[PDB]
Amino acid sequence: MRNSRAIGVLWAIFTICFAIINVVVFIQPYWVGDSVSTPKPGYFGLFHYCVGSGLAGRELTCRGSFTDFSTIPSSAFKAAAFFVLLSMVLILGCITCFSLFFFCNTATVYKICAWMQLLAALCLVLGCMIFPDGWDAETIRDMCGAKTGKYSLGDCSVRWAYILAIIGILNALILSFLAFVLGNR
Amino acid sequence: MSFVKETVDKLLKGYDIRLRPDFGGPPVCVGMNIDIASIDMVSEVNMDYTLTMYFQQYWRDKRLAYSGIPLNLTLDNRVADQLWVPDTYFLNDKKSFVHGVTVKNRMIRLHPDGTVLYGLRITTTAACMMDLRRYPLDEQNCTLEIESYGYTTDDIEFYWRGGDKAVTGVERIELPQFSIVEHRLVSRNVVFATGAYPRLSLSFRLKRNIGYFILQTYMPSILITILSWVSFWINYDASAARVALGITTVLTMTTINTHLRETLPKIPYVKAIDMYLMGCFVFVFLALLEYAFVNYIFFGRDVNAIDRWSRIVFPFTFSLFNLVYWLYYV
Amino acid sequence: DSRDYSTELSVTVAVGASLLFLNILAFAALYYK
Amino acid sequence: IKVLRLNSNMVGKIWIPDTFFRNSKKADAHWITTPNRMLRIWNDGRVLYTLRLTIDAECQLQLHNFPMDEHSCPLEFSSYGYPREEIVYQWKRSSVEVGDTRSWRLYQFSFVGLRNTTEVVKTTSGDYVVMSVYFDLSRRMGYFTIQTYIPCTLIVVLSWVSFWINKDAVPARTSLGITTVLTMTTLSTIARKSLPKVSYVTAMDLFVSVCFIFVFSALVEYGTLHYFVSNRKCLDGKDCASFFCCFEDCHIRIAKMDSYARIFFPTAFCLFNLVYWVSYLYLG
Amino acid sequence: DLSRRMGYFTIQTYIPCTLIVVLSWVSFWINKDAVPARTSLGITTVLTMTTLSTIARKSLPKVSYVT
Numbered sequence: 001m002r003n004s005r006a007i008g009v010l011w012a013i014f015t016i017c018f019a020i021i022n023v024v025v026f027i028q029p030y031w032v033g034d035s036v037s038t039p040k041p042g043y044f045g046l047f048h049y050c051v052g053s054g055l056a057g058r059e060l061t062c063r064g065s066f067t068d069f070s071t072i073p074s075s076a077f078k079a080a081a082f083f084v085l086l087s088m089v090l091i092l093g094c095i096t097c098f099s100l101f102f103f104c105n106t107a108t109v110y111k112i113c114a115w116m117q118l119l120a121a122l123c124l125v126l127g128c129m130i131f132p133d134g135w136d137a138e139t140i141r142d143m144c145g146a147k148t149g150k151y152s153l154g155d156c157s158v159r160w161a162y163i164l165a166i167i168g169i170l171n172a173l174i175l176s177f178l179a180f181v182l183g184n185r
Numbered sequence: 186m187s188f189v190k191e192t193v194d195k196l197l198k199g200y201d202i203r204l205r206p207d208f209g210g211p212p213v214c215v216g217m218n219i220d221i222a223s224i225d226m227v228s229e230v231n232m233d234y235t236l237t238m239y240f241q242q243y244w245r246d247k248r249l250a251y252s253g254i255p256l257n258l259t260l261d262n263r264v265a266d267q268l269w270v271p272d273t274y275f276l277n278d279k280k281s282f283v284h285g286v287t288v289k290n291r292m293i294r295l296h297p298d299g300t301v302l303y304g305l306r307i308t309t310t311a312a313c314m315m316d317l318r319r320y321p322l323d324e325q326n327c328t329l330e331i332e333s334y335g336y337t338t339d340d341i342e343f344y345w346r347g348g349d350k351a352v353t354g355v356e357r358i359e360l361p362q363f364s365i366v367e368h369r370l371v372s373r374n375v376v377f378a379t380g381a382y383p384r385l386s387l388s389f390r391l392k393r394n395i396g397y398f399i400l401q402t403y404m405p406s407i408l409i410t411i412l413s414w415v416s417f418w419i420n421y422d423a424s425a426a427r428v429a430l431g432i433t434t435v436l437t438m439t440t441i442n443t444h445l446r447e448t449l450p451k452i453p454y455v456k457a458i459d460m461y462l463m464g465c466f467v468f469v470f471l472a473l474l475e476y477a478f479v480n481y482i483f484f485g486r487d488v489n490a491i492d493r494w495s496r497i498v499f500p501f502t503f504s505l506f507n508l509v510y511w512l513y514y515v
Numbered sequence: 516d517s518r519d520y521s522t523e524l525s526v527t528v529a530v531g532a533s534l535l536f537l538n539i540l541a542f543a544a545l546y547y548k
Numbered sequence: 549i550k551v552l553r554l555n556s557n558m559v560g561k562i563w564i565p566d567t568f569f570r571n572s573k574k575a576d577a578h579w580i581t582t583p584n585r586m587l588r589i590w591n592d593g594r595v596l597y598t599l600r601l602t603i604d605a606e607c608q609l610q611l612h613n614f615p616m617d618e619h620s621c622p623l624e625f626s627s628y629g630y631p632r633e634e635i636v637y638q639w640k641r642s643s644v645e646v647g648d649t650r651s652w653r654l655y656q657f658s659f660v661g662l663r664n665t666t667e668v669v670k671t672t673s674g675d676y677v678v679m680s681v682y683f684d685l686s687r688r689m690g691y692f693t694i695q696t697y698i699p700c701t702l703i704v705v706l707s708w709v710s711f712w713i714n715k716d717a718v719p720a721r722t723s724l725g726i727t728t729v730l731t732m733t734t735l736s737t738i739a740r741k742s743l744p745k746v747s748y749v750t751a752m753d754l755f756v757s758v759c760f761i762f763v764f765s766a767l768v769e770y771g772t773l774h775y776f777v778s779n780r781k782c783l784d785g786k787d788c789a790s791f792f793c794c795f796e797d798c799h800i801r802i803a804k805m806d807s808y809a810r811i812f813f814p815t816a817f818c819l820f821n822l823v824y825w826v827s828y829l830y831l832g
Numbered sequence: 833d834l835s836r837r838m839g840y841f842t843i844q845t846y847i848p849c850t851l852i853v854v855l856s857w858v859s860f861w862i863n864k865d866a867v868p869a870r871t872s873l874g875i876t877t878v879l880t881m882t883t884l885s886t887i888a889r890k891s892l893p894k895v896s897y898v899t
């Protein structure tokens with residue numbers, strides 16, 4: 001009972017950390033950065049993107065928000081951000097469902113977050129799949145090179161948010177299986 | 186210095202504003218360019234839009250030819266008073282002005298080959314009709330028509346200088362409710378019995394953005410309509426609860442309707458949002474009428490048949506209504 | 516920095532690997548009977 | 549006389565620069581009781597020219613983070629006709645002159661800082677030098693805290709009050725839920741009147757929408773509780789399905805839905821508020 | 833010569849008002865013993881009619897005579 005309590009608490013801590021990571025990668029725009037071969041400096045995320053103005057300092061002018069779908073310069077980005085937001089909603093639903101440990105039996109709540117974490121991982125995986133497809137947009141083509149396109153990195157780099165998305169996917173899958181085994185124990 | 190002064194002095198004399206270039210000759214061809222700075226506001230109520238732009242004409246005049254001066258001359262704007270210019274004007278204009286601060290926002294430029302470039306900073310309230318039958322799911326077809334008041338095609342001709350590159354700065358425009366989708370240039374001649382008059386047309390297609398309405402008009406209506414359906418699962422004897430729920434849903438829809446029209450454009454015109462709200466109103470009305478039937482038949486005269494069938498028909502019928510609405514209007 | 520994204524990518528990979536190591540450590544600890 | 553102050557009338561005779569403010573939709577100078585323009589000459593060969601202007605300069609306000617939105621409104625000017633080769637502008641240097649801020653007409657906004665910049669534009673008719681001054685402004689949240697945020701939060705709390713009312717009080721809880729929905733709609737109607745008719749939603753719109761969803765969820769929760777309580781009536785461990793869907797039998801433990809709701813709704817709302825405020829204040 | 837278009841005002845006022853009146857009648861079929869139900873129905877119907885009445889004179893001058 002001591003071991004189960006300790007691992008349950010640690011699992012809660014890790015799930016909270018995964019939710020924080022999901023929020024950070026969702027809001028932050030550092031999914032793709034400029035490069036030496038890139039025509040202009042800048043970086044675009046799921047919905048937000050900063051473009052070089054066209055002078056020495058460039059002012060880091062930025063435009064784009066998930067609150068305004070009309071500003072997202074692609075239909076693949078609108079789906080990727082939607083899936084990531086769905087993952088956010090599911091993991092936050094689990095964090096709320098921690099409260100159900102007060103009344104319900106432990107196993108049921110553990111399994112419920114097991115499925116919620118699995119679905120969050122699935123949605124984040126789908127977002128990661130469709131996100132490269134939107135690289136062919138006119139703005140991205142002007143930014144990350146003419147050769148850049150659907151899954152074609154081209155003359156442009158990749159930044160920490162995109163890999164942290166995969167890290168969060170792995171963490172979500174591990175936490176989902178951990179909760180599944182916790183429920184039966 | 187003095188050579189330039191006497192050059193312009195001889196240029197000005199012998200020049201008659203009352204006569205156009207090559208009065209006895211062929212028509213003078215006027216190239217026209219536009220650089221839109223800001224579309225300030227687009228009004229459905231008045232069916233017009235204000236547009237601030239750098240209008241530029243461009244025409245050859247033999248009288249204003251000078252030699253020996255390779256540098257281009259940007260004379261004072263007041264010099265434009267003494268020089269002939271086309272009778273260009275906008276047909277669908279309701280009111281327009283030229284900015285006066287600090288000096289009159291106007292420019293005249295001569296070139297060694299005798300060409301004239303005449304630029305103005307015009308803020309014009311152009312008129313375009315708006316087919317609001319599909320509002321807010323609508324796309325508008327707004328235009329700026331530019332023509333010569335007196336001259337026919339035989340006396341003056343208009344064309345777009347630079348072709349499709351005639352109009353620029355559209356990407357710099359971000360309207361607060363519309364999103365520019367496309368702009369088109371049309372150069373033609375309107376033919377009457379007396380003669381044909383040149384015309385140019387700059388037509389923008391504007392798509393409306395609906396996320397405002399989707400989140401404060403459609404979603405509340407759908408959720409109140411569902412909360413009305415919650416009545417069908419309440420026990421039939423709970424007259425106070427079911428009647429209160431139904432009548433308060435009707436009142437809430439009435440409130441949404443009355444306070445919505447305060448914000449939308451003041452036009453007594455029938456629109457798609459009006460149909461959607463009327464349909465939701467009818468649905469909540471029928472939801473309360475359903476309990477009228479239920480209370481009379483069973484209590485007044487093992488769930489009963491009316492609630493049993495309502496629980497599937499009302500969601501199903503509302504889904505069908507939504508399908509028809511969205512398919513017809515999109 | 517201009518295009519210098521080596522340190523940020525490296526430290527992100529490092530912290531992610533550390534977190535995943537903790538997660539799999541807990542999972543392996545629970546798996547054993 | 550080393551300094552010859554000039555009348556405001558014959559200044560039109562003397563050439564003056566074509567400086568016009570680019571991002572101005574309407575400007576003017578007051579003409580009574582006399583013209584409000586002055587000129588001065590210095591025999592060394594210097595001309596000074598001062599006017600009085602009230603510019604209604606445009607400012608593209610990105611209201612996505614409203615009412616947590618900070619702006620950098622510009623004021624740009626350049627010669628109208630003379631390209632860079634014909635006129636080049638410059639500052640007096642040593643910052644820009646501004647009076648006391650406390651007397652300014654800034655109520656909804658609070659002044660923060662002032663900046664100046666210069667650049668060359670590449671317009672069709674030559675390359676002009678443009679000079680800009682940026683004023684940094686921060687909105688004051690105090691009016692929207694008492695008008696929108698606190699009433700919405702308290703209405704959500706009053707929706708949570710239904711969970712502590714007895715389940716058998718059907719008219720009471722139904723009226724409470726539906727009237728909370730009506731009140732939330734009433735607040736939502738006026739939430740936008742300060743803002744323009746912009747088509748994308750803002751932070752406060754999202755807050756209001758989430759509060760509406762919370763009160764809707766509370767009413768739906770009571771409807772669900774009312775229907776069921778009264779109207780209704782291999783490999784590891786064991787099977788792979790045992791490791792997954794408990795789904796045993798299935799609800800028996802649904803009469804205690806109010807106990808679950810009493811924690812779930814406050815906890816969910818607190819998490820939403822934490823993420824929302826952290827995202828919009830610090831991490832955005 | 834200009835003839836007004838009435839469909840807008842139809843959907844805005846004539847149909848909502850008629851349906852609020854048909855809902856008022858709905859009270860006559862509810863059981864008489866249901867005092868809170870029928871009382872709430874009647875008074876909230878009056879409130880809804882009052883709310884609807886205000887939007888009548890929203891695209892009209894303040895002519896003293898009634899339309």
Ligand SMILES: CCCCCCCC/C=C/CCCCCCCC(=O)O[C@H](COC(=O)CCCCCCCCCCCCCCC)COP(=O)(O)OC[C@@H](O)CO
Binds near residue numbers: 005008098102103106
């Ligand atoms: C990054 C740092 C994060 C720091 C956060 C630290 C928080 C860490 C909490 C972990 C909870 C899960 C641990 C595993 C719980 C395992 C179960 C347990 O310990 O015992 C139960 C709950 O105990 C308990 O008080 C635990 C109750 C749950 C407490 C959690 C509620 C959610 C709070 C909102 C979260 C916000 C997080 C983000 C904030 C930034 C009570 O037995 P009880 O027989 O009576 O039940 C009835 C049943 O037996 C059948 O009737």
Ligand SMILES: CCCCCCCC/C=C/CCCCCCCC(=O)O[C@H](COC(=O)CCCCCCCCCCCCCCC)COP(=O)(O)OC[C@@H](O)CO
Binds near residue numbers: 896897
């Ligand atoms: C179930 C069956 C239901 C059937 C329904 C039956 C309905 C029967 C229809 C009535 C239509 C009423 C139309 C007239 C109402 C408008 C009254 C009116 O015109 O105002 C003043 C009346 O006189 C005056 O000053 C003073 C006299 C005041 C009389 C006002 C009558 C109000 C309507 C009373 C209705 C109560 C009904 C009760 C039912 C419970 C005259 O203006 P005054 O010259 O000052 O200046 C000039 C100014 O009028 C220029 O416009």
Ligand SMILES: CCCCCCCC/C=C\CCCCCCCC(=O)O[C@H](COC(=O)CCCCCCCCCCCCCCC)COP(=O)(O)OC[C@@H](O)CO
Binds near residue numbers: 068071399749765
């Ligand atoms: C417990 C229960 C909780 C409630 C459930 C959760 C409710 C969640 C709330 C809101 C999200 C709902 C999904 C909305 C999806 C619509 C997303 C969308 O943007 O579609 C636009 C229209 O589509 C088109 O072109 C053509 C297709 C038009 C069809 C529009 C569908 C609207 C449906 C009405 C929504 C009802 C939701 C109620 C669910 C209960 C296209 O974008 P556009 O480029 O124009 O940029 C304009 C924009 O950026 C300006 O802000």
Ligand SMILES: CCCCCCCCCCCC(=O)OC[C@H](COP(=O)([O-])O)OC(=O)CCCCCCCCCCC
Binds near residue numbers: 697
């Ligand atoms: C219903 C009771 C629970 C939820 C209450 C949520 C807070 C109340 C509603 C939010 C708005 C409000 O009342 O105050 C808003 C102001 C923002 O003003 P400012 O400080 O940014 O200038 O103050 C803020 O900055 C808001 C701070 C809110 C923090 C989020 C709640 C954290 C609760 C614990 C989370 C673990």
Ligand SMILES: *[C@@H]1O[C@H](CO)[C@@H](O[C@@H]2O[C@H](CO)[C@@H](O)[C@H](O)[C@H]2NC(C)=O)[C@H](O)[C@H]1NC(C)=O
Binds near residue numbers: 296
């Ligand atoms: C004066 O103006 C004329 C026309 O505006 C310029 O002529 C063009 O100059 C550019 C660049 O100097 C060339 O690329 C073009 O081929 C020229 N002709 C045309 C028709 O555009 C002229 O250069 C200007 N004088 C200068 C810059 O000293």
Ligand SMILES: CC(C)CCC[C@@H](C)[C@H]1CC[C@H]2[C@@H]3CC=C4C[C@@H](O)CC[C@]4(C)[C@H]3CC[C@]12C
Binds near residue numbers: 092819827
């Ligand atoms: C309580 C549980 C169940 C759900 C909570 C979900 C919350 C945290 C979600 C729902 C909608 C989300 C917002 C949607 C859009 C944007 C715009 C983007 O530019 C920054 C993030 C921001 C502002 C999101 C922040 C997080 C958010 C408020």
Ligand SMILES: CCCCCCCCCCCCCCCC(=O)O
Binds near residue numbers: 474854858
């Ligand atoms: C246009 C709609 C008019 C509605 C008028 C209110 C009628 C609601 C109550 C009807 C009760 C059912 C009466 C018929 C019962 C039966 O057929 O046996």
Ligand SMILES: CCCCCCCCCCCCCCCC(=O)O
Binds near residue numbers: 495
């Ligand atoms: C709004 C359409 C959905 C409602 C459809 C109602 C179908 C009612 C079918 C049952 C009619 C008979 C009711 C009286 C039964 C009895 O004799 O007591």
Ligand SMILES: CCCCCCCCCCCCCCCC
Binds near residue numbers: 069754757762
């Ligand atoms: C169409 C423009 C995009 C608008 C996006 C709105 C997102 C709203 C999120 C709603 C989350 C509701 C959570 C309810 C349960 C707490």
Ligand SMILES: CCCCCCCCCCCCCCCC
Binds near residue numbers: 689690691694
């Ligand atoms: C003047 C600065 C902005 C407004 C600051 C807060 C105003 C007072 C807030 C009162 C909140 C009452 C909550 C009561 C909860 C029971």
Ligand SMILES: CCCCCCCCCCCCCCCC
Binds near residue numbers: 810811814
């Ligand atoms: C804040 C009132 C506490 C009442 C405690 C009585 C027993 C009910 C236990 C559930 C309390 C959950 C309160 C959640 C935070 C408002």
Ligand SMILES: CCCCCCCCCCCCCCCC
Binds near residue numbers: 467839
């Ligand atoms: C130009 C069209 C004007 C609108 C004409 C009326 C449209 C149909 C109105 C139907 C109202 C619902 C009646 C439901 C009765 C139960």
Ligand SMILES: CCCCCCCCCCCCCCCC
Binds near residue numbers: 842846847850
């Ligand atoms: C020439 C067009 C006429 C349009 C008719 C509008 C009718 C508005 C609804 C009034 C219906 C009253 C019927 C009441 C039956 C009890």
Ligand SMILES: *[C@@H]1O[C@H](CO)[C@@H](O)[C@H](O)[C@H]1NC(C)=O
Binds near residue numbers: 641642663
């Ligand atoms: C503004 O311009 C002046 C002159 O070019 C310069 O000295 C100063 O550093 C600039 N910045 C500020 C904040 O004044």
Ligand SMILES: CCCCCCCCCC
Binds near residue numbers: 506
């Ligand atoms: C005037 C708009 C009417 C829309 C249809 C009404 C709902 C019919 C549901 C059967």
Ligand SMILES: CCCCCCCCCC
Binds near residue numbers: 510
């Ligand atoms: C705006 C057109 C609405 C058509 C409604 C047709 C009725 C569908 C539900 C039976």
